Amino acid sequence: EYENEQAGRYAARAAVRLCQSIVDTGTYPATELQQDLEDLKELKNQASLGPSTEAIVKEAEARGIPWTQLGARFMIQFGYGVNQKKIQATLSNQTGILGVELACDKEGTKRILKDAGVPVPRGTVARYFDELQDAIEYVGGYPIVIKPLDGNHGRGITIDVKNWQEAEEAYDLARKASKTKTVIVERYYTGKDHRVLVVNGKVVAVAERVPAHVVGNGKSTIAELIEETNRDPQRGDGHDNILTRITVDKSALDILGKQGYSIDSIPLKGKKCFLRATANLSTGGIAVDRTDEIHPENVWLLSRVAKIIGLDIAGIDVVTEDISQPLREVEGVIVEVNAAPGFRMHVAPSRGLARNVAGAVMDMLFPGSKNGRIPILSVTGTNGKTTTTRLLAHIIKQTGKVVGYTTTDGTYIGEYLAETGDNTGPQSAHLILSDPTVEVAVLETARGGILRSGLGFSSCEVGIVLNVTADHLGIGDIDTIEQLAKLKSVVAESVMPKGYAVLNAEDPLVAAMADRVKGQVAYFSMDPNNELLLRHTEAGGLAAIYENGYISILKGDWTLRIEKAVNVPITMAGKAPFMIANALAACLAVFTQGVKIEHIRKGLSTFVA
Amino acid sequence: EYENEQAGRYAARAAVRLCQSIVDTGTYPATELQQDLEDLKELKNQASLGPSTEAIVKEAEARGIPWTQLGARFMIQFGYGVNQKKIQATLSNQTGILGVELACDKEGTKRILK
Amino acid sequence: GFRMHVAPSRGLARNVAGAVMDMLFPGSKNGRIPILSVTGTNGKTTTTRLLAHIIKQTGKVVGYTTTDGTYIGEYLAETGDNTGPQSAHLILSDPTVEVAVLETARGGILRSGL
Amino acid sequence: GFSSCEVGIVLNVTADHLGIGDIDTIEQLAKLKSVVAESVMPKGYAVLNAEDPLVAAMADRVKGQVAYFSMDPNNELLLRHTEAGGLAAIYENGYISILKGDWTLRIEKAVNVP
């Protein structure tokens, strides 16, 4: 058993080498063992997804929704056929280009939000020095924030200035950093900052950010809290854990020096003393859950903002004195909107209740108690797989559905050929199930695919087993007909509880698969006097027989005749008895899915080989 | 009547100046007239959309569907309230981020199509 | 771009804009919502508020603008607003408004029109 | 009066009044009250009180899912049921909370309920 393909193969290759080295020398060097272990760890880390992706994948697996990994851009596809959805990290196939592009433009989104009445921080553009004073009149005085018009990742932007000389030097620095000599000055808003997550137009979680700080509640200074904090298991490196190690950098040391306290200075009255002012969880900030104590008007406003920008999943930054009051009484503003936010901060608040963000996302993708599954019919057997598969496809084509079917001849999507030189393994199944237009999948499953790579799907709605004959043996580890029966039993065993297993009652080996099969069992037989079939029909039903020149279906105590068995072109007026079994199997499989009798008749009369 | 707001205001401001210059001197210099005409042409060209946008806007107007110009990124909004749609040049609000990003990656789209 | 298809220079032109507009609005439908414009000398505000309250009884989101302020359904959107085209644009651009009720004063008609 | 019910709620069983009919023992009363819990369809739910041992003993011989409600948030049976499964309700810190497995959903402050 393995969890990662490359890691599993490497471990398998290394085990035999280790055993050979032991039997050759009596012991294995420790350095080689450590090399192998670190190589395994590197392999495991390499084939790993971003934490949001594992969260969503685990949530999907908890609901029984199939998921596959596309090879293009680390995209994950949920579902099959026309019911599939795609996610990358948090962006879905429904997320718009226009909304994402607008969110990346700060001035554009600010102007859009201002036109809709949403409170936004006041600001003004200026290009000449003498105009700055006038701008100070518009913003309302001090303090102010200086930023350049064209800049990414905060190039040359100050945080807080409260007098004339610092404002002048910050403006000069920004102008020397600005590419167009023009600078926006905006009113600095003080207050607690919150990060609100909006999914499908509804607020899911609200988190309050507190800047990285220390508290002297234990009557101790930083010299001991540095080791005290290291004992918490949450601390670590990377970008997967919310609690990162406290990096005492030169900038942070200068900030705490100008903060107004010293290394040995005890906090006054027992107040938190901050180490940085960025208020970031990656830096080492603290999240607080405030989902419950939010005013309904604020929720309505945030939902309106998310709908106005045009983002299904959005992260809004708010600055307010209190989140339990409307943003009008307090001087609250909307700072920025992010199109692809991470929710690692909301899953582990570290103070409060955790919120199920992955559940909300999965509910948005699949609204009701529905999964992205499509009808699947897997046909296996020794002799007549191809004809049965083609007959099933032709019969289902009579209904207005697009049918994708794979067989020995080639892979077909509806009416037009998709692949000529294809195999009947998992590759063709993946090709069929990934098409955005296929509604019903019909797959011929040969034993070679099962032995080499196994089945390409977790479960099937209909599993047909025609017959098992030991006409060819000696391949692989299959040397006995019992082994072949066990190999063919995989299709029957991998049937969901609401599915059907269509088995041949005449063959004792195939009929022995009645047990260890979840879901209903339907028998088809060329002999209408089979004891097992009659016993099954008397208590239950759903069998198919060939009684008096007729293809009949027994639904218990009732008999439904389909065709005269001589009007079917493939039977050649009944001269070929082998094709009648395939016709019986196909008709029974189609009937188990609810297709009307007249459709089956029309499909059977028209189909040609 | 005007077709462009800035062009119309400029023409209105220029007409009275031209008439005052005529009644003051008896004629208007040709260089100033050419300057005003080229300024009007520049104003008309400045407040113009990409040809796809005029095509779609004309088609929408032929069907009596209201259209407005948003001030963010040259986006055009059709309709009112819950029945509105947005287009930039040919991208709609229904166009996905994933599809656009995949189309820009040649190797990724080739591997997907294969 | 579809400028190449509109003017093939050899063959028949194709209506790409028509196809795009059909994709945006499938049937013979437009992006219009119910609009009620109230004008008068004396009782515009009371009539507008009464209309909004009556329509609110039906399960619809109503956006209405009057002298007091611009309201989107139940929650106040703008306190210090005018009854001109600006409030109308604010009402009609909201992605949740289904019925618009607007008080139209003569000042807005004289200054900027409807 | 019905063959099956979608939701069957059993609050508590106390032997405050006995001697009627053939019900003279609290076990007989528990068996009589167990009819509602037992007559629940496989897709239904049985809402039982985890604090009462007699009511909690009805966990077996019941078709369909079982949901426990308790006034004590430290009940061992409720926590064990939530760890493997979920759908319980508790009163933890002045809150009416619902446990859906590893998640807690708070409803009311328990003092705003009249």
Author numbering:
A (entry chain C): 115 to 723
B (entry chain D): 115 to 228
C (entry chain D): 456 to 569
D (entry chain B): 570 to 683
Paper excerpt:
The biosynthesis of cyanophycin is achieved by a single enzyme named cyanophycin synthetase (CphA1) that catalyzes peptide elongation coupled with ATP hydrolysis. The discrete active sites of the G and M domains are used for extending the Asp backbone and attaching the Arg sidechain, respectively.
In the apo state, Glid adopts an open conformation and is the furthest away from Gcore. On the other hand, the sidechain position of Phe692 in the apo form inhibits ATP binding but not the interaction between Mcore and Mlid. CphA1 is known to synthesize cyanophycin in E. coli cells; hence, cyanophycin is the most likely candidate for the molecule with increased density.
